[PDB]
């Protein structure tokens, strides 16, 4: 039905002009991605070395890559083989073609997570709102199990589930991971998978504001200086008597 609700405005650490992006959070959010989110969501536009300078250290990132496997190049016959992932291959399609998603997932197709924060309005807020907030299907509404109920999601008939159910945890520094903290982190990491350039963008922006803020007055004084012969200028008309 064409009747719905729009997400509120959460105070992320990466909204409001010159603003980093919580990197310790991107990392916890990566954890959330690899453990709970990746099972049914592809992020095929992000590789392991992207996680380098950012959250993890070089060795750390390779170790994660190493872990599981992919279908590497042709064995000298004509069949491919398996090996421990390198730092250069992108995260890991759980479903081959599109219809495999339909098969293993009620008949629905779970959309890619490479962008998503830029592919849905409100961005991280919508994902945050889609995550944490889940509700009891009101009166006269007929779910049908495949579709769950979800405020925010258009139509209210979803197909996902709330895979945030307070846990299926992880941890480095051991953050008390409830559904809240586990959600914020995914979105924060999601921001980064959508817009990696985020930090630097805003850094150049700081420099751009400081420079423009210094060039603008100077170019103006250059201009009024030359125009001053004209702005200050006097006319007189002296016709023959």
């Amino acid at each position: 039905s064409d009747l719905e609700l729009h997400p509120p405005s959460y105070p992320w650490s990466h909204r409001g002009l010159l603003s980093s992006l919580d990197h310790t959070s991107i990392r916890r959010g990566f954890q959330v991605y690899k453990q709970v989110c990746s099972s049914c969501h592809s992020m095929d536009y992000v590789a392991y070395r992207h996680l380098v300078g950012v959250c993890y250290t070089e060795d750390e990132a390779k170790a994660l890559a190493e872990e599981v496997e992919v279908q590497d190049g042709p064995n000298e016959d004509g069949e491919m083989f398996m090996r421990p992932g390198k730092l250069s291959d992108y995260f890991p399609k759980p479903y081959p073609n599109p219809e495999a998603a339909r098969a293993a997932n009620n008949g629905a197709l779970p959309p890619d997570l490479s962008y998503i924060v830029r592919a849905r309005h409100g961005g991280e807020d919508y994902v945050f709102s889609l995550l944490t907030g889940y509700c009891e299907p009101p009166t006269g509404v007929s779910l049908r199990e495949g579709l769950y109920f979800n405020p925010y999601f258009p139509g209210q008939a979803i197909g996902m589930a709330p895979p945030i159910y307070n846990e299926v945890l992880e941890f480095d520094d051991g953050t008390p991971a409830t559904m809240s903290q586990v959600a914020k982190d995914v979105c924060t990491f999601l921001r980064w998978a959508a817009e990696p350039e985020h930090d630097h963008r805003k850094r150049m922006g700081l420099k751009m504001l400081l420079m423009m803020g210094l060039l603008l007055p100077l170019v103006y004084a250059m201009k009024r200086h030359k125009w001053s012969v004209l702005k200050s200028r006097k006319l007189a008309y002296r016709p023959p008597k």
């Binding site: 603003s19 980093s20 992006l21 310790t24 520094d173 400081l210």
Partner: protein
Amino acid sequence: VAPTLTARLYSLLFRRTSTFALTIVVGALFFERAFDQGADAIYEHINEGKLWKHIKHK
């Protein structure tokens, strides 16, 4: 300060287009070093993802 800084800037460095060009280019170097770093520095009032701060933990 006294018989003027600008006056000396003009007399010793701005009367010729040579020296003028020359100072601008020399002044271009340092400015870059000072600002590029200055703006990177000011940016450090966000002791957050600060790669340096994380470098110590992991």
